[PDB]
């Protein structure tokens, strides 16, 4: 009656501690009921590995908890996929990146910040890059035990920025007597840690006027953020007299720009711009302009706001006579889209355009067709069926 | 007999400690000998300020040492210039940016670096931005008292990069037992200090293979350098297995690129590119490509190489009969060049062109002529004389 279609596909990322294990499942419907087969990205069948990988009676793929000694790259750091098939044909799921994570040595560090009186301070909880996908800032704590937490109230002396930095407005001599530690949390184990080093501010009292200067000399950077997150664009400059900061956004591919419009969603916290509930349209090149009496400096930031990938094929099914063409159009959403690719019954077609054309249909052209859209973080698939007239 | 010409102008920038003070001189030849006045940016006359600004004995401008309480912007943060004149005419020198810098306390710090075994490590002496113009790396020293200095020998385990970072090739577990400090020099006070924190490397041994990853997620940066310096382009990537690194330069205004040609001048140290004895032509957009068996990653760096401004006029002196044409050619070198302007006996002309033509000389056109070339940071002048026949 109908070829297979996925109901439930496992997600793109399956991250887990060796102490927890994981399970992934795949569901597909069709008539007859499709068979469910676990494969690797290269199409090869996956079987059990005693103690480490198990295909269950109901077709789940299970990774039991395991000793670090028993870690195996080809099991625990591996792209899998689910294959569903019946007599009409086969479809393969989006990529499933299985990543088991063992404990690692890490120590967070807080560089000392020198900050001119009246200017904003930004303390950073430096987390080693090789644990940073899992270990993130949970909160900050001052030397008295006051806890500073993520908050939607941006109008206070203190703000833990969504990106984890501690922002301190309008620093005064009293702010240099306080010290701060950052509490980090491992999202796979739940383990929290408080940085051993006490983060310090030194508050300077310059006598000469100082034109604005940024923390670093580079005048351009790129930033990636995801849709529906609160994206932080820093602008770490200082000056005496205290500077004013204004943000602009360039019209794509031009030398002209518009002042950013601050409102309930797009906020400025001293020099820092926070784009709340981000959407793909917030993408673009931003300009932070900092001026005082003595001069001005400007820095650019290229923001890319990503969105979850998805795809569909127009039409879901078509019945085409012999000798006549079959055409499939991959309709996709999300951002970025790096590649589009096509499959027929679980095997690649050498086509990377969004419209797949089969010029003259034959008997062996029938079956299941798929387009896959991919970027660095994500993949999505759509399936369609070709019947014979 | 002849109009004034500068034998000696002071440098575009005159930075000094309040403890040191400073003195600047102008010398000019001429017959009769030219008098030498000091003027302010706006061409106005500069007079003595007791204990802060004096014309001392032989006519140079003197800023004695002073206490922070005595600081005054009108004296200590000011563009000056030299005005030399006699019977035949007047010339004005290049801008002299005088900046007195009242001493401040500072410390440098070194972040601890996590490095995959076999990869290159780069330790950074982090100098606060408010003193970065005056404080740079002098040397590094380890826990055993071994000292590492700048060297033209790029081939050892260790290299202090020209930009001050400590580079360590091919790190192994042994390298994790050492700790490092940087010694910095303040060029205004002459002071040297050891860093407030020690740097160390944590050598990691990944459980599986790891595609190349960079120190930060930013895909682009900018870098400013000066002609004749050794310019360092970092490419701080790690991978497992240890990756290989290739450098390219984009063809200006295109998507296309060419591999960097390594020779006696342009060198590669592991992943790091060093362009020695830089020239303006080295400017452009560079691409660092990092690969290993599991993947590849790339990052862009926009380099600008400046060149010092200078100017000369052709001819230095010319005697012209009445009603005949007088021509001056302003030859100049440097990068960038934002403005070209002309001056006559210390007064601006409405001429923006490098060639000044006078096609029917009067009595009044006699005197001294100057062309000025400027950018946002720098200026240069040249003088010529017009005598009548
Ligand atoms: C230059 O200015 C600094 C102040 O910014 C002076 O240095 C301070 O001198 C006091 C003594 O009055 C010491 O207690 C401080 O430790 C010094 N501070 C620093 C940062 O060095 C210095 O005396 C001034 N120079 C002159 C000639 O007055
Ligand atoms: C502010 O700084 C910019 C440089 O980023 C400069 O172009 C502009 O002139 C400055 N504003 C004023 C009023 O000087
Ligand atoms: C190196 O990685 C880049 C991506 O940064 C990729 O374009 C290129 O194909 C890779 N080179 C090789 C030889 O694999
Ligand atoms: Cl296996």
Cα gap B42→B95, rounded to integer Å: 11
Cα gap B273→A320, rounded to integer Å: 59
Mutation pick for ligand 1 pocket among B16, B17, B51, B68 (CB with most ligand atoms within 8 Å): B68
Contact of A351 with A330, CB cutoff 8 Å: no
Quote the ligand 1 centre to B77 CA distance (angstroms).
Answer: 19
Q: Does the beta-carbon distance from A128 to B208 stay under 8 Å?
A: no
Whether residue B95 sits in one domain with residue B37? yes
Q: Of the residues A58, A73, A102, which one is the last residue of a structural domain?
A: A102
Residue numbers in A near B107 (CB within 8 A): 112, 202
Q: SS3 for B353?
A: coil
In B9-132 the beta strands, taken as DSSP E runs, fall at 13-17, 22-24, 27-31, 35-40, 54-56, 60-63, 77-85, 90-92, 96-101, 113-116, 121-123
CA A89 to chain centre: 34
Dihedral sign of CA atoms A346, A350, A351, A356 in order = negative
Cα gap B74→B44, rounded to integer Å: 12
Atom from ligand 3 closest to the CA of residue B295: 2
Q: Does the beta-carbon distance from A128 to B114 stay under 8 Å?
A: yes
| Buried b / exposed e along A35-56 (16+ C-beta atoms within 10 A) | ebbbbeeeeeebeeeeebbbbe
Whether residue A386 sits in one domain with residue A330? yes
Write the DSSP symbol of residue B310: E
Write the DSSP symbol of residue B280: G
Structural domain boundaries, residue A46: 1-102
Residue numbers in B near A116 (CB within 8 A): 130
Experimental determination technique: X-ray
Whether residue B133 sits in one domain with residue B168? yes
CA B173 to chain centre: 39
Q: Of the residues B206, B240, B255, which one is the last residue of a structural domain?
A: B206
Q: How many CA atoms lie within 13 A of A278 on its CB side?
A: 24
H-helix or E-strand containing A22?
strand A22-24
Contact of A356 with A342, CB cutoff 8 Å: yes
Contact of A200 with A114, CB cutoff 8 Å: no
- Which is nearest to B275 in space by CA: B236, B342, B229? B229
Whether residue A248 sits in one domain with residue A194? no
Locate A182 and state its tokens. 């950052």
Chain B within 8 Å of A55 (Cβ-Cβ)? no
Chain A within 8 Å of B33 (Cβ-Cβ)? no
Query: Helix H segments across chain A?
Result: 73-76
Q: Of the ligands numbered here, which is closest to the C-alpha atom of A75?
A: 4
Q: Of the ligands numbered here, which is closest to the C-alpha atom of A296?
A: 2
CA B187 to chain centre: 14
Cα gap B211→B242, rounded to integer Å: 9
Contact of B249 with B256, CB cutoff 8 Å: no
Q: Does the beta-carbon distance from B77 to A130 stay under 8 Å?
A: no
Contact of B83 with B343, CB cutoff 8 Å: no
Q: What angle (nearest 5°) sits at the alpha carbon of residue A26, between those of residues A45 and A312? A: 105
- Give, in order, the Cα–Cα distances in Å from A236 to each of A122, A183, A212, A232, A233: 8, 23, 10, 12, 10
Q: Which residues contact A222 (CB under 8 A, 6 or more apart)?
A: A301, A302, A303, A304, B217, B218, B219, B220
Residue numbers in B near A304 (CB within 8 A): none
Closest partner residue to A221 among B213, B218, B224, by Cβ? B218
Place of tokens 């991919």: A374
Contact of B354 with B329, CB cutoff 8 Å: yes
Residue numbers in B near A238 (CB within 8 A): 129-130
Cα gap B160→A156, rounded to integer Å: 44
Instruction: Name the closest residue on chain A to residue B17, using Cα atoms.
Output: A208
Cα gap A96→A76, rounded to integer Å: 12
* Partners of residue B82 on adjacent β-strands: B38
Quote the ligand 1 centre to B293 CA distance (angstroms).
Answer: 58
CA A8 to chain centre: 22
Cα gap A114→A238, rounded to integer Å: 10
Pocket of ligand 1 (CB under 6 A): B 18-19, 65-68, 102-105
Cα gap A63→A33, rounded to integer Å: 26
Quote the ligand 1 centre to A46 CA distance (angstroms).
Answer: 73
Total number of residues shown for chain B: 389
Question: How far apart are the CA of B226 and the nearest CA of chain A, in angstroms?
Answer: 14
C-alpha gyration radius of chain A: 27
Write the DSSP symbol of residue B69: G
- Phi-psi region for residue B20, left (φ > 0), alpha (ψ -120 to 50) or beta? alpha
Cα gap A289→A285, rounded to integer Å: 13
- Which is nearest to A52 in space by CA: A98, A97, A92, A103? A98
- Which is nearest to B283 in space by CA: B335, B356, B338? B335
Atom from ligand 2 closest to the CA of residue A295: 14
Whether residue B200 sits in one domain with residue B219? no
User: Per-residue DSSP letters for B157-193?
Assistant: SEEE-TTS-EEE-S--GGGGS-EEEEEEEETTT--EE
Place of tokens 């644990």: A131
H-helix or E-strand containing B44?
none
Q: SS3 for A76?
A: helix
Closest partner residue to A222 among B99, B219, B224, by Cβ? B219
Say how many domains are in chain A: 4
What is the maximal distance between C-alpha atoms in chain A? 87
Question: How far apart are the CA of B157 and the nearest CA of chain A, in angstroms?
Answer: 24
A 10 A CB-CB count for A336 gives 18
Instruction: Name the closest residue on chain A to residue B115, using Cα atoms.
Output: A130
Q: Does the beta-carbon distance from B218 to A222 stay under 8 Å?
A: yes
Contact of A95 with A40, CB cutoff 8 Å: no
Residue numbers in A near B114 (CB within 8 A): 128-130
Contact of B203 with B175, CB cutoff 8 Å: yes
Closest partner residue to A71 among B99, B207, B220, by Cβ? B207
- Which is nearest to A173 in space by CA: A121, A234, A215? A121
Place of tokens 């009067």: B362
A 10 A CB-CB count for A192 gives 12
Cα gap A108→A120, rounded to integer Å: 23
Whether residue B235 sits in one domain with residue B187? no
A 10 A CB-CB count for A214 gives 19
Quote the ligand 4 centre to A347 CA distance (angstroms).
Answer: 21
Q: What is the CATH number of the domain that holds A56?
A: 2.60.40.10
* Partners of residue A29 on adjacent β-strands: A5
Q: Of the residues A288, A308, A328, which one is the last residue of a structural domain?
A: A308
Whether residue B151 sits in one domain with residue B94? no
Whether residue A165 sits in one domain with residue A148? yes
Residue ID of nearest Cα to ligand 3 atom 10 = B296
Instruction: Name the closest residue on chain B to residue A73, using Cα atoms.
Output: B208
Torsion of CA B239, B243, B247, B248, to 10 degrees: -90
Whether residue A377 sits in one domain with residue A287? no
- Give, in order, the Cα–Cα distances in Å from A226 to each of A136, A373, B74: 16, 18, 50
Whether residue A249 sits in one domain with residue A163? no
Q: Does the beta-carbon distance from B208 to A116 stay under 8 Å?
A: no
| Buried b / exposed e along B208-233 (16+ C-beta atoms within 10 A) | eebbbbbbeebbbbbbebebeebbbb
Contact of B117 with B203, CB cutoff 8 Å: yes
Q: Does the beta-carbon distance from B71 to A107 stay under 8 Å?
A: no
Whether residue B258 sits in one domain with residue B213? yes
H-helix or E-strand containing B74?
helix B73-76
Q: SS3 for B27?
A: strand
Which of A:72-131 have CB within 8 Å of B? 73, 76-77, 102, 104-105, 107, 109, 111-112, 114, 116, 126, 128-130
Dihedral sign of CA atoms B8, B12, B18, B19 in order = negative
CA A320 to chain centre: 41
Locate B9 and state its tokens. 């102008």
Quote the ligand 4 centre to B294 CA distance (angstroms).
Answer: 18
Place of tokens 């008098």: B35
Residue numbers in B near A126 (CB within 8 A): 111
**H/E/C letters for each residue in B1-22?**
CEEEEEEECCCCEEEEECCCCE
Q: Does the beta-carbon distance from B102 to A206 stay under 8 Å?
A: yes
H-helix or E-strand containing B76?
helix B73-76
Cα gap B163→B172, rounded to integer Å: 24
Locate B299 and state its tokens. 């990052």
Question: How far apart are the CA of A368 and the nearest CA of chain B, in angstroms?
Answer: 31
Q: Of the ligands numbered here, which is closest to the C-alpha atom of B51?
A: 1
How many beta-carbon pairs under 8 angstroms link A with B? 91
Do β-strands B27-31 and B60-63 pair in parallel, antiparallel, or remain unpaired?
unpaired
Whether residue B272 sits in one domain with residue B303? yes
| Buried b / exposed e along A161-185 (16+ C-beta atoms within 10 A) | bbbbbbbbbebeeebbeebbbbbbe
Quote the ligand 3 centre to B98 CA distance (angstroms).
Answer: 50
| CB distance A297 to ligand 2 below 6 Å | yes
- Which is nearest to A91 in space by CA: A10, A5, A2? A5
Cα gap B26→B11, rounded to integer Å: 10
Q: Of the ligands numbered here, which is closest to the C-alpha atom of A376?
A: 3
Cα gap B250→A244, rounded to integer Å: 36
Distance, first Cα to last Cα, chain A: 15
Quote the ligand 1 centre to B67 CA distance (angstroms).
Answer: 7
């Amino acid at each position: 009656q109908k070829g297979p279609v996925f109901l439930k596909e496992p997600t793109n990322r399956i991250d887990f501690s060796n102490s927890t294990g994981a399970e992934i499942e795949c569901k597909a419907s069709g008539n007859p009921m499709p068979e469910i087969i676990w494969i690797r990205s290269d199409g090869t069948a996956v079987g059990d590995v005693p103690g480490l990988r198990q295909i269950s009676s109901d077709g789940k793929l299970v990774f039991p908890p395991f000793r670090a000694e028993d870690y195996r790259q080809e099991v625990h750091a591996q792209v899998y996929a689910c294959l569903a098939r019946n007599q009409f044909g086969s479809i393969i799921s989006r990529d499933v990146h299985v990543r088991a994570v063992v404990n690692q040595f890490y120590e967070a560090e807080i560089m000392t910040e020198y900050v001119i009186r009246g200017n904003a301070a930004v303390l950073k909880c430096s987390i080693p890059s090789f644990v940073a996908d899992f270990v993130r800032v949970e909160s900050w704590i001052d030397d008295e035990g006051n806890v500073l937490s993520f908050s939607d109230n941006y109008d206070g002396k203190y703000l833990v920025l969504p990106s984890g930095e501690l922002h301190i407005r309008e620093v005064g001599p009293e702010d240099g007597y306080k010290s701060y530690q950052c509490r980090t949390k491992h999202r796979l184990t739940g383990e929290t840690r408080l940085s051993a080093t006490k983060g310090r501010l030194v508050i300077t009292e310059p006598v000469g006027s100082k034109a604005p200067t940024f923390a670093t000399a580079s005048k351009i950077s790129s930033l990636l953020g995801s849709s529906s997150s609160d994206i932080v664009l820093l602008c770490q400059a200082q000056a005496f007299p205290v500077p004013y900061t204004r943000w602009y956004k360039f019209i794509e591919g031009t030398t002209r720009k518009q002042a950013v419009v601050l409102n309930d969603r797009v906020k400025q916290v001293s020099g820092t711009l926070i784009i709340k509930d981000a959407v793909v349209e917030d993408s673009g090149k931003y300009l932070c302009v900092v001026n005082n009496s003595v001069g001005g400096e400007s820095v650019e930031t290229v923001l890319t706001v990503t969105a979850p990938l998805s795809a569909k094929i127009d039409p879901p099914t078509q019945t085409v006579d012999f000798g006549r063409p079959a055409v499939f159009t991959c309709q996709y959403t999300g951002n970025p889209i790096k590649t589009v690719s096509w499959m027929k019954d679980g095997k690649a077609i050498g086509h990377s355009e969004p419209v797949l054309r089969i010029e003259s249909v034959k008997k062996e052209d029938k079956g299941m067709y798929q387009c896959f859209v991919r970027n660095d973080q994500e993949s999505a698939e759509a399936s369609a069926e070709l019947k014979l007239g």
